Single-chain antibody
Framework: YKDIQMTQTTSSLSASLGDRVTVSCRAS??????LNWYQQKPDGTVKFLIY???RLQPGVPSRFSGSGSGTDYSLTINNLEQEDIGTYFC?????????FGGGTKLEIKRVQLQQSGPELVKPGASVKISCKDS????????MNWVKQRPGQGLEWIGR????????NYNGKFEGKAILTADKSSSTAYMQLSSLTSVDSAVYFC????????????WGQGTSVTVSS
């Protein structure tokens, strides 16, 4: 296994409404500005905020700004507002496998992709979770899968292109996850096998276009608990 390590040394920030908050991120090597930012709201949902270091995505308020180059990047929020609360994660899109920082949870001081429901299984078993896309670009988009454990940032599992069934996997999950897709029902599936407590996490599906190295839209996530 080989990758570019992303780190957000500051895991949590406590601030007041109106402050100027900054979230920092470092890549282990030059990622040539291919650095994206996501905000995970308290309800667990994830939204794509900035692409290629500074490109705000449609709808994102002007108070947000991205800076950086080389290995160091930052997201700045001017005039902090309540809706900005959540956990911010950086992600380099320069070199597969895509990698994410550990996230920085921001607190105040004193879906088009519908995934199947929560799973609860025993060690050694397998589970198949689904992700139905109600949109119309399912077969012409990469469907990515991401793993999140408490305090374990976010890990890119792999992706599949429904159009021709092509698939790419993160070496770390090759024997663990199997990605498939049904063109007719616009549904992508991920089967996890030989489950251990390490597989206990929330898994998200997220699609991306064929030319941008970021996850455009995210499902709500599926919780998988492995229990003895």
């Amino acid at each position: 296994y080989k990758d570019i390590q992303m780190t957000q040394t500051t895991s949590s920030l406590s601030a007041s409404l109106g402050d100027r908050v900054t979230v920092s991120c470092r890549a282990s090597q030059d990622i040539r500005n291919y650095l994206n930012w996501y905000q995970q709201k308290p309800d667990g949902t994830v939204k794509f905020l900035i692409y290629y270091t500074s490109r705000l995505q449609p709808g994102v308020p002007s108070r947000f700004s991205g800076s950086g180059s080389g290995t160091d990047y930052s997201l700045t929020i001017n005039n902090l507002e309540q809706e900005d609360i959540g956990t911010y994660f950086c992600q380099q899109g320069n070199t597969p496998p895509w990698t994410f920082g550990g996230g920085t949870k921001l607190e105040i001081k004193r879906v088009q992709l519908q995934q199947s429901g929560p799973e609860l299984v025993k060690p050694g078993a397998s589970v198949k979770i689904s992700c139905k896309d109600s949109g119309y670009a399912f077969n012409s988009s990469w469907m990515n899968w991401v793993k999140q454990r408490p305090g374990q940032g976010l890990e890119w599992i792999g992706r599949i292109y429904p159009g021709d069934g092509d698939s790419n996997y993160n070496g770390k999950f090759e024997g663990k996850a199997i990605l498939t897709a049904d063109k007719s029902s616009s549904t992508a599936y991920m089967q996890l096998s030989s489950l251990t407590s390490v597989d206990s996490a929330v898994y998200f599906c997220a699609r991306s276009g064929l030319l941008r190295y970021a996850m455009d839209y995210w499902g709500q996530g599926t919780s998988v608990t492995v229990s003895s």
